Structures are given as C-alpha cells and as structure tokens.
C-alpha cells in the first residue's frame, strides 16, 4: 500500500487545523468560532511553543484582536487561519534564520 | 514519554507547510517562493484532492494569480498560506456541510 496518506502533508495540515480549531472553537458552541478564553486555553496548550516563548498571555489578547476580523471577540475558520499564517511565517522565518533548505527528497 | 510531540497538531501542521512549501518553492531557488510550474506540480501532487476535483489545471492558474500578491508569479510564505487558508476553509466547509463536530476528547 503506497497510498497510505489520502491527504498530503499540506492537506493533513489543513485537517489538523480542522481538528484543533473545531475542538476548541467547538467549546464555545457559537458558530464554531474560537472564543477568547477558548483561544487563551488553545494558545497556551496547542501553541505554548509560541505563547510561553513570548513573555505574558497578554499576547494572546493581541493575537485575538488582530485576527478577530469578525470583531466579535472570537476567531472563525479564516481568522484562526490568519493566525496560522502568522504562526507559520514565524516558524518559517525561524527556518530562514536557521536552515530553510528543507528540500526533502 | 508523554511529550512525544514537541509540536502540536497546529504546529506540526505549520511545519508541514514548511516542509511542502520549501521543498517545492525550493525548486525555483528564487527567494523560497513557489513558482508557477512548481505550484502547478505542487497542486497536482500535494493538492490533487482539490486540483483534480475541480476540472482543469487552469484553476491552479487562478489560485496562483489570486495568491500572488507579490505580483511576481510565485507564492511566498504568506501567499502559500493564503492558499492554505482557502484550502482549509474548503475542507472546513466540507465538514460544516457534513459533520463539524470534530470535538476530539
């Protein structure tokens, strides 16, 4: 069985975001939107790498309100992904400042 | 060993995007930007789920020019992630039109 991965690395990444997003956003039960405290818990757990590396949880506050383009105080599908964009760009930048030659053969 | 995953599901998703992005974008060797043909190959391989489900590869053309905010004809870190946003939103929407109760305990 060569095709063990129905999704690819990006697609599975995407379904990962589905998993993590919908489990935390699914706590507030609004419109599958990641509420303030849900995102606080989210970022301190699922993004503790970033969150705890910052300095104080007030950053999650800055994240939320930056991404909260719906201006409801929650992060929807795209708002969470906007986040993922900045997150990815931070880790990418890490690689660019380290070794971005991730040319996996 | 409980902490076998240094990255979380979102963080690993993010490093996945690093992996897939930098391997294809690393083919053009510009500024780690996913060039037209590199993205064509990318989307037909890594996103064949979406690409082949559309109808014709001219869609990748539409993706590129939508995401090519750098207006160079390539997708950078954020432009690829803009893509990932629309991709994720499509798969999310799939779940929302199916079963978005991905409340993994």
From Swiss-Prot, chains A, B:
<dbReference type="GO" id="GO:0014911">
    <property type="term" value="P:positive regulation of smooth muscle cell migration"/>
</dbReference>
<keyword id="KW-0007">Acetylation</keyword>
<feature type="modified residue" description="Phosphothreonine">
    <location>
        <position position="10"/>
    </location>
</feature>
<dbReference type="InterPro" id="IPR011992">
    <property type="entry name" value="EF-hand-dom_pair"/>
</dbReference>
<dbReference type="GO" id="GO:0048306">
    <property type="term" value="F:calcium-dependent protein binding"/>
</dbReference>
<keyword id="KW-1015">Disulfide bond</keyword>
<keyword id="KW-0597">Phosphoprotein</keyword>
<dbReference type="InterPro" id="IPR002048">
    <property type="entry name" value="EF_hand_dom"/>
</dbReference>
<feature type="modified residue" description="Phosphoserine">
    <location>
        <position position="5"/>
    </location>
</feature>
<dbReference type="GO" id="GO:0001726">
    <property type="term" value="C:ruffle"/>
</dbReference>
<keyword id="KW-0539">Nucleus</keyword>
<dbReference type="GO" id="GO:0008285">
    <property type="term" value="P:negative regulation of cell population proliferation"/>
</dbReference>
<feature type="modified residue" description="N6-acetyllysine">
    <location>
        <position position="27"/>
    </location>
</feature>
<keyword id="KW-0106">Calcium</keyword>
<dbReference type="GO" id="GO:0005509">
    <property type="term" value="F:calcium ion binding"/>
</dbReference>
<dbReference type="GO" id="GO:0098641">
    <property type="term" value="F:cadherin binding involved in cell-cell adhesion"/>
</dbReference>
<feature type="binding site">
    <location>
        <position position="38"/>
    </location>
    <ligand>
        <name>Ca(2+) 1</name>
    </ligand>
</feature>
<dbReference type="InterPro" id="IPR013787">
    <property type="entry name" value="S100_Ca-bd_sub"/>
</dbReference>
<keyword id="KW-0479">Metal-binding</keyword>
<dbReference type="GO" id="GO:0005912">
    <property type="term" value="C:adherens junction"/>
</dbReference>
<feature type="binding site">
    <location>
        <position position="74"/>
    </location>
    <ligand>
        <name>Ca(2+) 2</name>
    </ligand>
</feature>
<dbReference type="GO" id="GO:0005576">
    <property type="term" value="C:extracellular region"/>
</dbReference>
<dbReference type="InterPro" id="IPR018247">
    <property type="entry name" value="EF_Hand_1_Ca_BS"/>
</dbReference>
<dbReference type="GO" id="GO:0044548">
    <property type="term" value="F:S100 protein binding"/>
</dbReference>
<comment type="subunit">
    <text>Homodimer; disulfide-linked.</text>
</comment>
<dbReference type="GO" id="GO:0007165">
    <property type="term" value="P:signal transduction"/>
</dbReference>
<dbReference type="GO" id="GO:0008156">
    <property type="term" value="P:negative regulation of DNA replication"/>
</dbReference>
<dbReference type="GO" id="GO:0034774">
    <property type="term" value="C:secretory granule lumen"/>
</dbReference>
<feature type="modified residue" description="N6-acetyllysine">
    <location>
        <position position="3"/>
    </location>
</feature>
<feature type="binding site">
    <location>
        <position position="68"/>
    </location>
    <ligand>
        <name>Ca(2+) 2</name>
    </ligand>
</feature>
<feature type="modified residue" description="N-acetylalanine; in Protein S100-A11, N-terminally processed">
    <location>
        <position position="2"/>
    </location>
</feature>
<dbReference type="GO" id="GO:0042803">
    <property type="term" value="F:protein homodimerization activity"/>
</dbReference>
<dbReference type="Pfam" id="PF00036">
    <property type="entry name" value="EF-hand_1"/>
</dbReference>
<dbReference type="GO" id="GO:0005634">
    <property type="term" value="C:nucleus"/>
</dbReference>
<dbReference type="GO" id="GO:0070062">
    <property type="term" value="C:extracellular exosome"/>
</dbReference>
<feature type="domain" description="EF-hand 1">
    <location>
        <begin position="13"/>
        <end position="49"/>
    </location>
</feature>
<feature type="binding site">
    <location>
        <position position="79"/>
    </location>
    <ligand>
        <name>Ca(2+) 2</name>
    </ligand>
</feature>
<feature type="modified residue" description="Phosphoserine">
    <location>
        <position position="6"/>
    </location>
</feature>
<keyword id="KW-0677">Repeat</keyword>
<feature type="binding site">
    <location>
        <position position="33"/>
    </location>
    <ligand>
        <name>Ca(2+) 1</name>
    </ligand>
</feature>
<feature type="binding site">
    <location>
        <position position="72"/>
    </location>
    <ligand>
        <name>Ca(2+) 2</name>
    </ligand>
</feature>
<feature type="modified residue" description="N-acetylmethionine">
    <location>
        <position position="1"/>
    </location>
</feature>
């Amino acid at each position: 069985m060569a095709k063990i991965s129905s999704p690819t690395e990006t697609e599975r990444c995407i379904e990962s975001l589905i998993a993590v997003f919908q489990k935390y956003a699914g706590k507030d039960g609004y419109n599958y939107t990641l509420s303030k405290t849900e995102f606080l818990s989210f970022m301190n757990t699922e993004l503790a790498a970033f969150t705890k590396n910052q300095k104080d949880p007030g950053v999650l506050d800055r994240m939320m309100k930056k991404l909260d383009t719906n201006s409801d105080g929650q992060l929807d599908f795209s708002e969470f992904l906007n986040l993922i964009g900045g997150l990815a760009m931070a880790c990418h930048d890490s690689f660019l400042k380290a070794v971005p030659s991730q040319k996996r053969t």
